[PDB]
């Protein structure tokens with residue numbers, strides 16, 4: 001006669017609407033995982049952690065910067081870093097472990113078995129997708145040290161056919177071979193859409209993503225002029 | 234209201250009651266209230282969004298139904314699972330890492346597990362395995378571990394003779410069939426609900442059991458089903474009554490427990506692995 | 516018609532100036548063999564490079580549909596074709612000519628990206644790129660022999676199905692050539708017997724749906740010819756003959772709608788002629804007065 005269920009945003013239900021995890025979202029939002037040297041990455045991550053209030057996380061980032069981005073034996077700290085990663089993982093804090101794996105790179109990947117690494121990666125990806133954070137999830141997938149996770153970002157290839165000929169186009173060109181005409185004509189500014197080309201399933205029309213976004217903000221008809229109620233107003 | 238379940242994203246709920254209605258609330262105006270079953274609906278659960286807005290409902294009419302939202306926003310009845318000769322107690326989708334797999338437990342002691350070969354066609358399901366628990370099943374809980382080191386594992390809790398009321402079954406790669414893996418002889422009180430804690434990087438599986446008290450086990454996988462070092466770590470008797478439902482944190486750290494007293498309380502463990510109550514709600 | 520100097524600084528004398536289709540981008544071929552590009556409430560230079568060994572006479576843009584493509588005739592018998600990647604990169608060089616390339620003007624985009632060059636030897640070549648995605652290849656197809664010293668060319672901006680491709684050729688007298696689908700080869704179409712003085716600029720006009728083409732000739736006196744179709748025969752008629760320049764006219768250019776004609780002569784005066792009958796609408800000078 002009783003039903004209990006906990007929620008994703010910390011909400012508790014039993015109908016009870018008990019509100020009763022913004023730190024995880026913020027850390028995912030402003031960690032830096034690539035494109036910068038190890039020292040800069042660790043310093044930025046520690047600054048973010050200290051600003052949020054996780055003192056131990058910032059201390060861990062700075063300690064990693066001391067340990068790696070510098071005599072003691074080269075492999076004297078490998079067991080320590082592996083133990084720190086396992087301690088973060090076992091307590092349910094997966095974002096820190098995955099971020100350390102991304103930032104350190106191959107310097108620590110060999111110290112952890114592929115099964116546990118993939119488990120951590122999948123858990124963090126599931127958590128990120130749960131909070132509707134696609135950007136950080138895709139960044140983790142792309143930077144993943146495990147090939148299995150990196151391959152999870154690839155039936156993501158769309159096939160395009162020119163309408164004037166009903167034939168396939170080359171996977172690297174914007175010019176139709178048969179019709180000899182640009183089938184990627186922009187539907188607003190009338191140029192060549194070499195990059196992002198937003199499409200409509202109904203009227204099969206589209207153009208520059210920014211142009212279409214700006215056009216739909218002031219009207220509801222397809223800019224190509226077909227009458228298809230694309231946004232239905 | 235017999236059960237409430239949040240969706241994957243935590244923005245929608247599915248509430249089923251004895252009024253022959255299953256309601257879906259969106260962040261909370263009920264966008265759809267439709268009659269589902271010929272009997273009272275016990276549990277309704279959500280599925281991973283990669284398969285779409287999919288609901289599973291088990292009822293007293295010996296049938297388990299799978300619902301899907303289609304575009305206003307109307308819910309359709311994708312499939313009926315009439316394999317059960319008696320009432321179906323609990324139904325739970327498997328974790329997304331195993332694909333679209335459904336498991337139902339019947340009051341006759343048979344746990345039936347289904348799977349749709351094509352995730353794009355929910356109208357078809359196949360009874361991949363059937364497990365006999367030799368006792369009246371009450372609730373089941375899948376193991377949400379996404380690690381490749383843990384085989385797909387399902388635990389069945391019976392509310393049935395002072396025998397073990399909790400059976401844990403594990404997938405065997407060679408035999409390609411579930412089999413008994415762990416039997417909790419220490420749990421002889423009737424079991425009303427079980428809920429595995431989300432793994433989320435942990436090296437061991439944490440099991441929460443609903444009984445006359447609240448019990449938490451850490452089924453550590455020791456190095457044929459894999460043996461476990463089963464050891465209860467939290468015997469909470471703050472309820473002073475029977476336990477109905479148990480729900481875990483979204484990170485598998487805080488266990489929400491609800492008893493017959495009408496009070497919902499949360500349990501978390503410090504760094505000594507000493508579980509303690511972190512709040513009382515009512 | 517208020518004239519105001521644009522905030523642009525050039526270290527060398529500019530020979531030719533060409534706008535873009537939108538009117539934002541522009542190109543100039545300065546006296547130091549430098550092809551510059553400016554961008555748009557002021558003008559900001561974005562590119563400048565040396566192109567050839569000799570002087571660059573005329574520079575003109577292509578249609579933006581194929582991309583930011585520039586052409587430049589030179590004295591080294593070369594007409595380089597440039598592309599924008601802002602790092603402008605030369606795509607090809609059309610050195611098939613034997614004498615100085617007097618002028619180069621891009622063809623209308625209604626028939627693809629084509630290119631024509633008039634050589635001082637009296638032969639006009641025509642280049643086309645079958646693959647728009649790869650501008651590094653340009654196959655010569657038509658070798659129009661004018662039998663006279665070519666001075667300028669101008670394509671026909673007409674894009675209707677009833678009008679064949681059309682190229683004007685001057686001399687330094689006016690010979691107009693039209694494409695013939697029956698023979699699949701360019702030939703002679705018409706000749707302006709009324710033109711005897713040397714020509715320094717020949718320019719068609721944007722038809723904008725007219726039933727006839729308009730030709731403007733730069734000579735000792737500005738002449739406007741209305742070519743009315745009836746090779747397709749033409750009713751060549753002269754509708755204007757202005758001696759206001761009192762000197763040889765060097766440049767002629769039409770507006771986007773083909774209604775007002777600009778003529779710049781040796782008198783240092785830019786004169787705008789508009790239909791009313793054609794009469795002057797504004798006399799300019801070097802300082803803009």
Ligand SMILES: [Zn+2]
Nearest residue numbers: 162165176179
């Ligand atoms: Zn085509």
Ligand SMILES: [Zn+2]
Nearest residue numbers: 186189208211
């Ligand atoms: Zn555009």
Ligand SMILES: [Zn+2]
Nearest residue numbers: 203205222226
């Ligand atoms: Zn459309």
